[PDB]
Design a protein around this nucleic acid. Structure first.
Ligand SMILES: Nc1ncnc2c1ncn2[C@@H]1O[C@H](COP(=O)(O)OP(=O)(O)OP(O)(O)=S)[C@@H](O)[C@H]1O
Ligand SMILES: Nc1ncnc2c1ncn2[C@@H]1O[C@H](COP(=O)(O)OP(=O)(O)OP(O)(O)=S)[C@@H](O)[C@H]1O
Ligand SMILES: Nc1ncnc2c1ncn2[C@@H]1O[C@H](COP(=O)(O)OP(=O)(O)O)[C@@H](O)[C@H]1O
Ligand SMILES: Nc1ncnc2c1ncn2[C@@H]1O[C@H](COP(=O)(O)OP(=O)(O)O)[C@@H](O)[C@H]1O
Ligand SMILES: [Mg+2]
Ligand SMILES: [Mg+2]
Ligand SMILES: [Mg+2]
Lengths: 340, 328, 258, 255, 338, 319
DNA sequence: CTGTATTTAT
DNA sequence: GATAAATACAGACCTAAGTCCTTGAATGCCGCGT
DNA sequence: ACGCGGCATTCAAGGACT
């Protein structure tokens, strides 16, 4: 029962092992969990829109809130979860969701009311509501409004623009802030200490910096580094260069080499160096990020050069995020900077 | 429940025609229509959260009384937009009499913009044939979806976005109903972020009441409003724009990064605020406005598609700097 | 006859004075066939300054809307086979062709957006413009040769058939080869030809045993062999090569495999 | 708690089948006097008002008032899972949720426990108005159903006229027209076949064929149906049960 | 043959020792393994490393593969069939064969195998770039909800098509392509075992340099030239280039020579001929652009314009169903540049 | 109030063919047909609210006299657009025997005939000819293109046009005189302008103005009926300076509550229908408007994209 | 437009 | 009878996609007759 | 009780979408 689940979680990926069981374990998204905690005492949960960068904790927060509301046993009856893995057409909105909302609130058991608040409603959690068509959300528009007495609706989407305007208007908008180093460093340190993970001074900060607002990626990176250190058996501490190697981070010397090749405006030499560079699995976005950091941060470049290079890197990132070929876009960007 | 355990957005839904504010012209026109009896086919098209549904439900209450949910065919057009609906339910309701009291019949169609073209083509004759004893009301956020024929048989009323005074009066009513206080600057910030939608106002007010440590005695300041809503403060907006405009690239990047990190503000809200500020500016040449608007629009679209936050912020800095560099 | 009956009720004398009004009110509006759409859309007079007033842009959009499934294909297939007559001063035929092709690329993007899981059919007039009108206006003029039918359909069907054949071959050789569908055609097929077809070209009918061993090493059949022999292009086409193989060798190969 | 037991499990079957087609959403509110059910059709043309009494139930116990909402489509499916020779038991806990239906026969030891999830139907107006209707008539249910189903083929509108000891059902359509004339007669030999009619003022209104055909589906409950008419008032189609009644309130068409 | 000599274990790997050590570090404690996404240049050996990791985690029986057919039903009544290579401890899904219905295969088969259950079964998504964004959105929660029963390992070449949440939910394992020296060593081992006479060893380095880091292509080219020289490689042995390479090269020559619409006739003809014979359009654009860049006559301005238009029409191809509609536009724009 | 008064559009619907004001040639031809008899098959097409249903109904009434109850079959095509309708109801009505005045025949009125499906329309082709001696079909539709060409062949193509301002003014004056409404010339002109030839819109707007404010003056009619969206959109598109276009957008469209999708769709429609601008510039502005429409439909609906679209259009016009 | 078919004309 | 005018007319039809609609075929339950 | 007889209901294929 509980012991089996405890052991199972005690040996699973750290991304799921330290999934926040309670609302207090949310590390930095205070502006929403305070509202949910103060709603815990009451029973007036508004319709909620959880929109933010991936890996910020929307799913964890909405899985802890319903738990604290209903209890482990009661939660199954009071919660309907519909992700993007299930059909998201009009029919699934007009039949499954409508039937679930129209259903009477399930009877709480004597154990449930005494310890848990058990509010007189149920929450429908729609993971990845952005994938749904405008038609399904239009159908949900009045479905949430009419049955708000016994049903509460939570929508989680990476991009708020996908959701139609009236649906976002009805739901309360809770923006989950990016999880940078400063705000999630305490959580990462807690996780590292729980597993006896040994690091240097700046490893955790650099892990969160490479993560770029994602606690899941930082947790996975820490787990990989810990596994490598344990396999080594040396007993020393994980070093930041090891993390950068394990995070798909281009070495500094190679970056200076690319910058030098860009400085010498020869198309053939740049093409040859890119052809040699793509023989290593350095992801193009990870190269554009470091090129942007080096060019913008350094003070030896003129302001106009910065203005033009920023737009060039923006265009390259936009094109690369559409599913293009890394080599052609990287070569085009490097050639444009060379002509710059 | 007792209508006390509901969200403020549904708790403070107007129940009589006198609790709907902002749309005074529509309210008085419709009240005079019903009082004299010549109530035509109504078309309430406007932005979300302007009170169209509340207005028509208050109309039903004032026309038929407390038993308005059984003498009125209220159909969610999004849920059921088929031609079978028009053939069976709407037509049988229009043709038959009332099971409760003698009087005319009102059919409210909510979100009729989702109705299929076949359904509207079927309705454009059901409305005309049964006009003697039945009246139709069409509510739709978007008027382009509705067929032109359906826009010829219904009188059109436009619901303007809620102005300042109506939002102030509703905020005062909500503040009186609860035990809460609002600073004038906090109320101004809430009005500005409302964009004419009372739904946002009520949601933010409830969220700020939840944010308050002990709501009995403390006041919701502008800081609470901005923190709970997540929108950037005007001071941060001005500081960021000033740093980009007339400071070095390193200092501008530092300022933008520290502003974003310290308060957790999103970059897209910063772009919208900066656009709002620079629009109020008076610009010497036309080209700088064109370049600024175009580049910022592509940056916002790429943010909508996602990507690298730092790269997009640097792109914003570069676009603004180049646009104002054209002004020399 | 119906027009004669209906008009004669009021006007007893149909003459040259009222023929224009009778024609303008009784004209048949018949949807043009996908060939006449290609002819009219690819006409210099239509996009001329005088012709624009006679044939407006909304008329052009409706001309597209007559057939919304074949006009983008017909224009794409016959926009670069016309002699232009609306070339701007300082613009050659190739520049107009490039601009038109860019416009057709944007129109294909719009079509993919319309005809995908989002079903953004409200963008259909935008697709009409981007696919048919702007590219044709860029290269408008006189038809040099004849209006051909869209070749994209047949080549797409051929591509689907070849993809099915490649899928079957790849799934047959999956155990032996750790590859994907595309990689097999890209890399292995040239070597598979050298291990199957070239031995028949050089050794003769005695290389049948080695060929059979090669096919059995990856669970290939005669149909698989024929399908691989049809996959090569350019210099490595085998359509003439297999014919020059003696019929005795092919017959013995078939009997031995059976 | 509620423990309502039917000696004839087919009685509730027949009652539900009477108005299963008419409405899908109904609020079965159980009080001490008996079960009262009321529902309105999607087109809002027919009002269904069921009133079962304690005399029907072999054992009826209702501790506190309770409102039990269910879907007729699913509930009828549940009822078709019982044989004729069983006794039904309706069970509901203190908090209304997941009503339990028990089909038990003790001659052959068999137990059939079925459940139905309750639904939150907001409409609980529960109002009917007693009016001094212009005409009150009673005829056998089979004859009225035969007339309705025979005249529904001609057109979609059936017109009923009440005059001095004359009842006429008129249906004029595209393929033709037809009118059935009956008079109130009393037969001492067979009282069940008699037809009564008490009229105050002449009555003239038209109803729909679909709703009339849906109403005559209730003829399987009682052998005689009483029909009361008034000028621009809801026609009352009443089927009297042993302990109560089932009434259909039809809304006529507009002239 | 390429399949004749393929490592069957982690300890048999010979190139990128860092990657091997990383894989053994992951395999040390296998009950705690994140979801993986193998990525790198095509032909590196990513699938071999994934299967070696599988053999390290499970027993040596992971290579006993069996093909099975699992019929599926789409939204319509159309019937769709998938070949699912399976092993007692793992199974493989390649959704590129299906079209826009890869979402259905994902959500049904992966959820089914999740309900079915060394407590996890690893699923290998060999083709992850051809996965539509809707399929990845459906797979977004399958990874997290069923993380106790199914642990995905993904094979990929370029991470750009893969969406951000999928990359976030999975550990990234970089695969550098083999260096020329290691490719030459592997070729030397092959020719030693295959008894291929070598006049000198510069031949192997030439094949390694003609493969651009690809080992599969290197071995295939080795055997291809071993058949044209009677299993005896000479110094002047020509390098065997695949047919599509030659066709693309002739296409570049024609674009460089004849910059006319009449030349565009035959350019579209060659593009149609290439597309009809199971050749992807993005590969066509990549090879065409790089071969055009290699033309010595063109100056720097033409090269820059060519790479710019190549990037633009690559974006257009990535956002377009009809491939030739963008390929012809790219070729015409390049002709206008010249 | 429990009861309502009949709308002016239906209360003052013409009951005789003479009351119809527009399309004088067609009305006179239909009056001559009504007097003489032998009504031919016809399709009546045009814009909404110009008197197509009224014309055919008056023709049927006058032609059939007291026999309108049986000789006329009323079937809204959108309501009944199935091949079953043609097979059973239309066929049975056509084969029905009915004694009529010599010249007259039975009339089938199929309003909104553009919505009939292909199967029913094709099945009607032989019913139109086989029973033509007794039954005459009449079609009314918004767009005649939806009706198949063979069906158009069997009937007279009687096409309507948008009502002229003079005829709408005449009808409005007649109703004003009949119902004693106070009015001003500016108010009537503004009602005509807002109606844009749609007489039904004109009468509905008159009803609204009278009931709401009581006086037909320009001020009241503009408050109760907004100015037509395409005109403000065209003014925004055709402004000389970028800042003027931005100001017009901000004041008239964004702040008044018009949506982004409505604005971009109306801009596209106005641009395609513009005549002063040359076709090439019109096409490139259409391209920019279409890109903005794509962004709005993908979900980026903001003032920023509309301002950027205006900037691109102004750059395009400014060379 | 190019190529094929049919009717009136030379 | 052949060769010109003079013109009407055919060249061709794909696969996915979401949702509503219609039409015919296949399916089910329920009333009447023996 | 037991078997057909229409008639309501469910299933499947084709067409259209400005
Ligand atoms: N605020 C947080 N506090 C603590 N752990 C967190 C937080 N956010 C994320 N995590 C960790 O990251 C894991 C995944 O979090 P999720 O809530 O699923 O991320 P996400 O917001 O759902 O991203 P998506 O699903 O791609 S939009 C959790 O199980 C935690 O281990
Ligand atoms: N004019 C108003 N006066 C008072 N409260 C208002 C007003 N408009 C909106 N609200 C509040 O906002 C809530 C939503 O109002 P609705 O009428 O449902 O919105 P809407 O105008 O119909 O827009 P939709 O639903 O997106 S079409 C109401 O229940 C009120 O609490
Ligand atoms: N470490 C290695 N040592 C020897 N051969 C290798 C090694 N890695 C890959 N190979 C060769 O690569 C071939 C398979 O390549 P593959 O894994 O299909 O490329 P990809 O990375 O594109 O999947 C095998 O036949 C094997 O001989
Ligand atoms: N030419 C006209 N003369 C007088 N009234 C008209 C005219 N056209 C339309 N109307 C008025 O419009 C109302 C409805 O018009 P209708 O004929 O239904 O429009 P449509 O022709 O689009 O069906 C009628 O009541 C009629 O009074
Ligand atoms: Mg999530
Ligand atoms: Mg609403
Ligand atoms: Mg009409």
């Amino acid at each position: 029962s509980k012991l089996a689940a405890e052991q199972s979680l005690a040996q699973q990926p750290w991304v799921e092992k330290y999934r926040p069981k309670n609302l207090d374990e949310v590390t930095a998204q205070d502006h929403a969990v305070t509202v949910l905690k103060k709603t815990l005492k009451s029973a007036n949960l508004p319709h909620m829109l959880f929109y933010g960068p991936p890996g910020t904790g929307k799913t964890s927060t909405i899985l802890a809130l319903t738990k604290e509301l209903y209890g482990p046993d009661l939660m199954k009856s009071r919660i309907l979860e519909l992700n993007a893995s299930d059909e998201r057409g009009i029919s699934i909105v007009r039949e499954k969701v409508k039937n679930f909302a129209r259903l009477t609130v399930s009877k709480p058991s004597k154990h449930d009311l005494e310890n848990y608040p058990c509010p007189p409603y149920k929450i429908i959690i729609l993971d990845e509501a952005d994938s749904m068509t405008a038609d399904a959300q239009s159908a949900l528009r009045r479905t949430m409004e009419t049955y708000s007495g016994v049903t509460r609706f939570c929508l989680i989407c990476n991009y708020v623009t996908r959701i139609i305007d009236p649906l976002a208007s009805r739901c309360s908008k809770f923006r989950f802030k990016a999880l940078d180093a400063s705000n999630a460093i305490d959580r990462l340190r807690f996780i590292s200490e729980q597993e006896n993970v040994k690091c240097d001074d700046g490893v955790l900060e650099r892990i969160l910096d490479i993560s770029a607002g994602d606690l899941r990626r930082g947790i996975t990176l820490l787990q990989s580094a810990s596994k490598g250190a344990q396999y080594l058996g040396d007993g020393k501490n994980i070093t930041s260069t090891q993390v950068e190697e394990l995070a798909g981070v281009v070495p500094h010397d190679i970056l200076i080499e690319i910058v030098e090749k860009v400085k010498s405006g020869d198309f053939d030499e740049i093409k040859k160096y890119v052809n040699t560079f793509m023989k290593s699995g350095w992801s193009a976005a990870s190269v554009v990020n470091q090129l942007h950091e080096y060019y913008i941060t350094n003070d030896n470049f003129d302001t106009n050069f910065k203005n033009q290079i920023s737009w060039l890197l923006f265009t390259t990132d936009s094109r690369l995020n559409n599913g293009t070929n890394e080599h052609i876009q990287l070569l085009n960007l490097l050639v444009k900077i060379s002509q710059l | 429940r007792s209508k006390e355990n509901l969200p403020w957005v549904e708790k403070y839904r107007p129940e009589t025609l006198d609790e709907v504010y902002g749309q005074n012209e529509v309210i008085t026109t419709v009240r005079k229509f019903v009082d004299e009896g010549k109530l035509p086919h109504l078309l309430f098209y406007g932005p979300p959260g302007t009170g169209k549904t509340s207005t028509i439900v208050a109309l039903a209450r004032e026309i038929y009384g407390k038993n308005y949910s059984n003498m009125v065919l209220e159909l969610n057009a999004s849920d059921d937009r088929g031609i079978d609906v028009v053939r069976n339910q709407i037509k049988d309701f229009a043709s038959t009499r009332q099971i409760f009291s003698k009087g005319f019949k009102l059919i409210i169609l909510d979100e009729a913009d989702a109705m299929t073209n076949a359904a509207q083509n079927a309705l454009r004759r059901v409305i005309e044939r049964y006009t003697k004893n039945t009246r139709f009301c069409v509510l739709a956020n978007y008027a382009h979806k509705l067929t032109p024929a359906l826009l010829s048989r219904c009188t059109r009323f436009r619901f303007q976005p809620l102005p300042q005074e109506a939002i102030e009066r509703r905020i005062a009513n909500v503040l009186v109903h609860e035990k809460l206080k609002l600073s004038p600057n906090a109320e101004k910030a809430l009005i500005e972020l409302s964009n004419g939608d009372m739904r946002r106002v009520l949601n933010v007010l409830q969220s700020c009441k939840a944010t308050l440590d002990n709501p009995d005695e403390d006041e919701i300041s502008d800081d609470v409003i901005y923190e709970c809503c997540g929108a950037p403060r005007p001071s941060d907006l001005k500081a960021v724009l000033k740093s980009i405009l007339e400071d070095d690239w390193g200092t501008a990047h530092y300022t933008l990064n520290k502003v974003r990190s310290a308060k957790g503000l999103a970059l897209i809200d910063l772009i919208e605020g900066i656009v709002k500020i620079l629009e109020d500016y008076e610009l010497q040449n036309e080209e700088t406005r064109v370049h600024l608007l175009t580049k910022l629009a592509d940056i916002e679209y790429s943010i909508s598609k996602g990507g690298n936050d730092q790269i997009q912020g640097s792109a914003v800095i570069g676009a603004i700097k180049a646009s104002f560099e054209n002004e020399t | 006859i119906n027009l004669l009956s209906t008009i004669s009720t009021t006007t007893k004398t149909i003459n040259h004075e009222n023929i224009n009004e009778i024609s303008k009110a009784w004209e048949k509006n018949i949807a043009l066939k996908p060939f006449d759409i290609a002819h009219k859309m690819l006409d210099g007079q239509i996009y001329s300054d005088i012709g624009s007033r006679n044939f407006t842009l909304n008329d052009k959009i409706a001309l597209y809307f007559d057939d919304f499934d074949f006009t983008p294909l017909m224009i794409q297939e016959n926009y670069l086979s016309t002699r232009p007559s609306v070339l701007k001063p300082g613009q050659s035929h190739l520049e107009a062709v490039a601009e038109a092709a860019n416009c057709i690329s944007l129109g294909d993007i719009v079509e993919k957006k319309i005809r995908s899981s989002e079903q953004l059919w409200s963008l259909l007039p935008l697709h009409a413009v981007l696919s048919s009108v702007y590219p044709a206006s860029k290269v408008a003029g006189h038809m040099a040769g004849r209006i051909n039918f869209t070749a994209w359909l047949g080549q797409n069907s051929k591509s689907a058939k070849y993809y099915r054949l490649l899928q079957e071959i790849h799934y047959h050789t999956r155990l032996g080869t750790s590859t994907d569908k595309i990689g097999l055609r890209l890399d292995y097929l040239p070597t598979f030809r050298k291990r199957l077809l070239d031995p028949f070209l050089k050794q003769g009918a005695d290389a049948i045993s080695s060929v059979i061993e090669v096919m059995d090493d990856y669970y290939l059949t005669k149909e698989d062999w024929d399908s691989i022999m049809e996959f090569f292009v350019g210099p490595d086409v085998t359509t003439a090569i297999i014919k020059k193989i003696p019929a005795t060798v092919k017959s013995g190969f078939t009997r031995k495999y059976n | 708690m509620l423990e309502a037991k039917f000696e004839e499990a087919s009685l509730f079957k027949r009652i539900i089948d009477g108005f299963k087609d008419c409405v899908q959403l109904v609020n079965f509110q159980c009080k001490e006097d008996g079960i009262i059910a009321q529902a309105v059709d999607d087109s809002r043309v027919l009002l269904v008002s069921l009133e079962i009494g304690v005399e029907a139930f072999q054992e009826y116990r209702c501790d506190h008032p309770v409102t039990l909402g269910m879907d007729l489509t699913s509930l009828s499916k549940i009822l078709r899972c019982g044989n004729n020779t069983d006794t039904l038991t309706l069970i509901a806990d203190n908090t209304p949720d997941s009503i339990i239906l028990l089909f038990e026969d003790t001659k052959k030891d068999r137990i059939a426990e079925y459940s139905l999830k309750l639904m939150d139907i907001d409409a609980d107006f529960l109002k009917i108005e007693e009016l001094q209707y212009d005409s009150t008539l009673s005829l056998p249910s089979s004859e009225f159903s035969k007339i309705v189903r025979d005249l529904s083929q001609l057109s979609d509108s059936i017109n009923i006229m009440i005059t001095k000891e004359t009842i006429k059902f008129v249906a004029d359509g595209d393929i033709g027209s037809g009118s059935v004339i009956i008079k109130p007669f009393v037969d001492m030999e067979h009282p069940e076949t008699s037809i009564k009619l008490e009229m105050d003022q002449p009555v003239d209104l038209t109803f729909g064929a679909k709703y009339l055909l849906d109403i005559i589906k209730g003829s399987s409950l009682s052998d005689r149906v009483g029909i009361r008419l008034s000028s621009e008032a809801p026609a009352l189609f009443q089927f009297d049960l042993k302990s109560g009644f089932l009434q259909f309130f039809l809304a006529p068409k507009f002239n | 043959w390429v399949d004749k000599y393929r490592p069957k274990s982690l300890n048999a790997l010979s190139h990128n020792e860092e990657l091997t050590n990383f894989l053994k570090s992951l395999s040390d404690q296998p009950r705690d393994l994140p979801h993986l996404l193998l990525y790198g240049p095509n032909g590196t050996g990513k699938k071999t490393r994934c299967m070696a990791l599988l053999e390290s985690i499970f027993g040596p029986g992971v290579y006993r593969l069996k093909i099975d057919v699992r019929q599926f039903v789409t939204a319509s009544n159309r019937k769709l069939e998938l070949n699912v290579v399976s092993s007692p401890y793992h199974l493989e899904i390649t959704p590129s064969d299906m079209g826009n219905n890869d979402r259905i295969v994902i959500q049904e088969l992966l959820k089914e195998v999740a309900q079915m259950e060394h407590r996890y079964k690893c699923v290998i998504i060999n083709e992850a770039n051809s996965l539509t964004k809707d399929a990845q959105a459906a797979l977004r929660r399958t990874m997290e909800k069923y993380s106790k029963n199914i642990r995905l390992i993904m094979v990929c070449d370029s991470m750009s098509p893969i969406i951000a949440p999928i990359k976030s939910r999975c550990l990234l394992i970089r695969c550098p392509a083999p260096s020329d020296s290691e490719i030459s060593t592997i070729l030397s081992d092959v020719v030693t075992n295959e008894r291929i006479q070598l006049e000198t060893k510069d031949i192997l380095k030439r094949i390694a340099q003609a493969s651009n880091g690809n080992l599969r292509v290197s071995l295939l080219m080795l055997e291809s030239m071993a058949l044209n020289n009677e299993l005896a490689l000479k110094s002047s042995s020509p390098i065997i280039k695949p047919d599509w390479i030659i066709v693309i090269h002739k296409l570049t020559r024609k674009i460089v020579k004849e910059r006319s619409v009449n030349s565009l006739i035959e350019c579209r003809a060659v593009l149609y001929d290439l597309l009809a014979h199971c050749i992807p359009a993005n590969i066509i654009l990549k090879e065409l652009t790089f071969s055009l860049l290699d033309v010595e006559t063109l100056n720097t301005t033409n090269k820059s314009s060519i790479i710019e238009y190549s990037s633009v029409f690559d974006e257009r191809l990535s956002l377009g169903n009809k491939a030739i509609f963008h390929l012809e536009g790219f070729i015409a724009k390049v002709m206008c540049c010249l | 109030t429990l009861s309502l008064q009949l709308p002016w559009v239906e209360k003052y619907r013409p009951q005789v063919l003479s009351d119809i004001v527009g399309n004088k040639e067609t009305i006179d031809r239909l009056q001559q047909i009504a007097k003489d008899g032998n009504m031919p098959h016809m399709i009546i097409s045009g814009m909404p609210g110009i008197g197509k249903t009224t014309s055919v109904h008056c023709l049927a009434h006058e032609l059939l006299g007291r026999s309108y109850a049986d000789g006329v079959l009323e079937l809204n095509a959108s309501d009944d657009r199935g091949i079953d309708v043609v097979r059973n109801q239309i066929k049975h009505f056509a084969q029905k025997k009915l004694h009529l005045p010599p010249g007259k025949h039975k009339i089938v009125i199929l309003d909104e005939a553009d919505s009939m499906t292909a199967g029913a329309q094709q099945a009607l082709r032989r019913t139109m000819e086989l029973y033509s001696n007794s039954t005459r079909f009449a079609f009314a539709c918004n767009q005649s293109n939806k009706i198949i060409e063979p069906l158009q062949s069997r009937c007279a193509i009687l096409r309507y046009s948008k009502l002229s301002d003079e005829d709408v003014l005449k009808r409005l004056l007649q109703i004003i005189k009949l119902e004693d409404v106070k009015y001003t010339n500016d108010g009537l002109e503004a009602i005509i302008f807002t109606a844009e030839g749609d007489m039904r819109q004109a009468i509905n707007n008159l009803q609204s103005t009278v009931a709401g404010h009581g006086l037909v003056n320009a001020d009241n009619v503009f408050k109760i009926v907004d100015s037509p969206h395409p005109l403000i959109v065209k003014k925004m598109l055709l402004a000389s300076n970028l800042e003027d276009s931005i100001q017009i957008l901000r004041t008239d469209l964004w702040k008044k509550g018009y949506s982004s999708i409505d604005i971009v769709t109306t801009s596209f429609r106005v641009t395609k229908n513009l005549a002063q601008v040359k076709e090439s510039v019109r096409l490139e502005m259409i391209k920019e408007i279409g890109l903005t429409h794509m962004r709005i439909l993908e979900g980026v609906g903001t003032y920023l994209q509309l301002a950027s679209m205006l900037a691109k259009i102004h750059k395009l016009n400014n060379k």
